[PDB]
């Protein structure tokens, strides 16, 4: 029986354009993690679109980190490949992105959708 | 039971100057955290000099991050902003530094001294 698709983000949210004033990148397992390392003292929420089976996340489509004024400051996306990310890969990447954004005293939370299925 | 001073670093290692190829720093209360962003895929050890009373760090003199080739790639030092810095503050700073060094797939370990008194995990 088929998995479920959960969206925090509208399609405009997924393709909103951004750029990092101070860029940082990384590749981990099979995910790409990005963060503006210029952003300071902001209030940030991570929003995601992903499928679930069970009550755990199965495949990430896209996670973005939004400041309260709507700037995109961070991002996790899957890559084409072998292997392909698990739920663990994504959990760790969230911790890695959150840790990174806290460096410059950003306050970071996740949506309820992420909290229930992915990171916590 | 007065404090005693624990020393992971030689006087040389303590007083050496250094520079970051890609500088990253932050102030967390009354500590200064620095790390070279250009260090990638290396093994790294954290060494510290600090005092201890009984079972925990009392005051940090200096903590530094070393490659096997002896470069300094990370540092945590106290600032004069007085009161001051607690063991907790230090604990948190080691945490944040490790996460920082781990971004670029460095493998970071700590001396037994740090592990016992200052930060574990």
Quickly count the helices of chain A. Answer: 3
What's the helical proportion of residues of chain A?
A: 10-25%
**Domains counted in the coordinates of chain A: how many?**
1
Largest sheet of chain A: 7 strands, mixed
CATH structural fold name of chain A: Nucleotidyltransferase, domain 5
Q: What is the second-level CATH architecture of chain A?
A: 2-Layer Sandwich
SSE string of chain A: EHEEEEEHEH
The count of DSSP E runs of length 2 or more, i.e. the number of strands of chain A, is 7
What's the CATH class of chain A, please? Alpha Beta
Largest interface: A-B, 10 and 8 residues
In whole angstroms, the N-to-C terminal distance of chain A is: 25 Å
What is the assigned CATH homologous superfamily of chain A?
Influenza virus non-structural protein, effector domain
Assembly form of the protein = homodimer
SS content category of chain A: alpha+beta
- The whole-angstrom Rg of chain A is 14 Å
The best one-word shape of chain A is globular
GO molecular function (chain A): protein serine/threonine kinase inhibitor activity; RNA binding
Main location (chain A): host cell
Protein name (chain A): Non-structural protein 1
Family (chain A): Belongs to the influenza A viruses NS1 family.
